Design a protein around this ligand. Sequence first.
Ligand SMILES: Nc1ncnc2c1ncn2[C@@H]1O[C@H](COP(=O)(O)OP(=O)(O)OP(O)(O)=S)[C@@H](O)[C@H]1O
Ligand SMILES: Nc1ncnc2c1ncn2[C@@H]1O[C@H](COP(=O)(O)OP(=O)(O)OP(O)(O)=S)[C@@H](O)[C@H]1O
Ligand SMILES: [Mg+2]
Ligand SMILES: [Mg+2]
Lengths: 364, 406
Amino acid sequence: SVLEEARLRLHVSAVPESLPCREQEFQDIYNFVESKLLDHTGGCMYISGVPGTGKTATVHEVIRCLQQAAQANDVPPFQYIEVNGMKLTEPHQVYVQILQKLTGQKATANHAAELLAKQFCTRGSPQETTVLLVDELDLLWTHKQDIMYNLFDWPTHKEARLVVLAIANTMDLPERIMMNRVSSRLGLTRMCFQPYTYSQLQQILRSRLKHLKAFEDDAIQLVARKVAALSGDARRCLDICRRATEICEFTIAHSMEAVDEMFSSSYITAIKNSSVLEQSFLRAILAEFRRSGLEEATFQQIYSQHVALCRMEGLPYPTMSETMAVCSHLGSCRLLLVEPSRNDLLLRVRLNVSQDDVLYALKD
Amino acid sequence: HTECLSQVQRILRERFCRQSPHSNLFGVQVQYKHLSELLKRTALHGESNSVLIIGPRGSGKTMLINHALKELMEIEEVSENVLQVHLNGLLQINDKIALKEITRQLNLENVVGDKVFGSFAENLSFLPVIFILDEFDLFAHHKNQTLLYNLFDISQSAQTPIAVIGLTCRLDILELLEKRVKSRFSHRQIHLMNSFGFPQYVKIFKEQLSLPAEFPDKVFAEKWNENVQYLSEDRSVQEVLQKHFNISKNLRSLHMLLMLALNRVTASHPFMTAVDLMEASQLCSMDSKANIVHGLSVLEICLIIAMKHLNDIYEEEPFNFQMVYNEFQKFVQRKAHSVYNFEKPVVMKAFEHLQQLELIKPMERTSGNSQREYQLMKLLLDNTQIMNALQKYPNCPTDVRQWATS
Ligand SMILES: Nc1ncnc2c1ncn2[C@@H]1O[C@H](COP(=O)(O)OP(=O)(O)OP(O)(O)=S)[C@@H](O)[C@H]1O
Ligand SMILES: Nc1ncnc2c1ncn2[C@@H]1O[C@H](COP(=O)(O)OP(=O)(O)OP(O)(O)=S)[C@@H](O)[C@H]1O
Ligand SMILES: [Mg+2]
Ligand SMILES: [Mg+2]
């Protein structure tokens, strides 16, 4: 079916071959790495960008192009090694991972570091240029900063023949997280990926759905515009498109439903579906807050206000245990803030949502 | 006779205590339809999805998953290809233990290895399997959320199909995740609320206490159905149900109340009565503080009255043993010759016993520097509670009562 084909095309893992939306950045990286590969000299580049900008996809596509060029005997052969920071149980274990990727030897963290140091500092046998990719750099931080210093200092050696690309989300990292000597080592080589404009998002969506007339232009334009105005991320755009397809299986209404179901908060409807006693408790809290003006109140005054409200409403007199159970249930779903493990009558209560939202939910 | 009572007791005890699966589903038609449809999509094809289910505890979160699995696993031979892994946040508190449980459940310990080696690339390199994550909120409190990130990554990868299911009671589960995993998390959420009125709750109660059609005796089953139907419209039973429904709409409390009601079913009374439900509701709705106060002694009552007087004179301020002793001495000295000639150590032991029952708690705890005397103590009771408890005290003397009134 057409909807099934659109769902298949719009999946996240269905990476395209090459989209010129980032062709400029691709070209810049293609010049830099090509220069580092032609001169038999190492280098380092730091790239910072918000998630969803295609950093990993762009790097992998550049690696694919470089490997294809090497296969066409135009570039000297190179060894590619990829490591992910968040896929490692311990920080020091990255030394074992790289060593096992290059020689397959098993050694301790310190011994693996020493062997890697010996290989990268001593004039050994002439090896292929090493392309090292490290993902999620900020998660390799250590109070001693030895791992980061070694990672960004080793390619400085002529014998290293190592090119390192660091992908991260924060551009401030080399300034406030990295010390001076290594900050100057990554200085002036910082690539920032700006978020896609709504035109770029529309171009990407059109490329996803070439030769397929399944969505109207209006839904596509609105989805790209919401994405631009909220995060400018292709991942949530694909999720919205898939949800719109699912709802259409059941127009602009589908996209609106997707965006206001996957982004909007459910606090209002949760309060609406609350019980009568919980509503009375919330009203008592609001009345006590208006009387006092403070954002913290003990359980005793709230209980007194609840008893007064119940007397006004004609409800039966509530026991302390019942009110405590209701409060504990409310705190379980993170609508309030309380520590009722030991304190019972002296519990500080803070609202987890804005007062105006509570008023707008309770007026109806 | 006795055999029928034993069989029905066993069946209802299995229904309530163990929470055995039942075909009856209440107000969850759309949610179950969505969940089953997505499970079938993930099973019959290589596509991957991630879903979180949010609801209050005791709202049958596990029942939906169990019913859907029992409905869809036995459709075809897909269950042979389908593998299921269940993880609970309580049993697995560390990533090492979670990895060990994952390896043992997959019967890959022979492939991966037996020793305590920290390498997990044996599974990672090799990696349809479905994942069930009980208490998903606890996993977000780990040091680095490595397991959750890896699961999301393999779900988003194009290597193997993986289905991830998480259970959460917190409504703020979206803000407990890091930016990366939140971006990689497919925003599929299902909310389990008791969105039904009181008459629907009455229908649920009527159906739950109804014998199944597979019971051997049919005329007795029909008579039981007639009894429960007749008991359905009784205004005392309706009043008890209305009270419990006002308190909370969770089905777990209703199951507990029904179980306690069935405990009073004997041979002489094969069919229940509204008075039985009244007794069960009364037993289920008693406050513990008044019960604790009722079991005290005279000296403790006098000390508590002195404590209330201290709280009244000094508005919301702490106190120590010396002031209470001084004003108890004042009370026993105003009276001419009352029989309360007690020394310091017995009063000190009484205060220690009162503090042991955790009716009084210290402030800014310290020891050695400050003795038990001259220590800031506070009371954890309300004046109306004391008055109500003292009203029901069996043999409260007139003197102490009038002192309390003063
Ligand atoms: N050139 C591109 N044009 C359009 N969409 C793209 C492009 N490159 C990547 N994408 C899409 O955007 C998604 C995000 O790509 P990633 O590289 O994984 O994100 P990232 O920028 O590396 O940030 P994280 O936090 O590391 S996932 C990809 O999975 C694709 O679906
Ligand atoms: N929609 C429903 N259909 C059938 N039974 C339900 C439904 N909702 C709740 N229940 C019943 O409610 C009772 C209590 O639910 P539980 O199964 O104890 O909660 P849970 O699903 O285990 O969630 P947690 O957070 O793990 S305690 C069970 O006996 C369920 O059969
Ligand atoms: Mg990435
Ligand atoms: Mg459960």
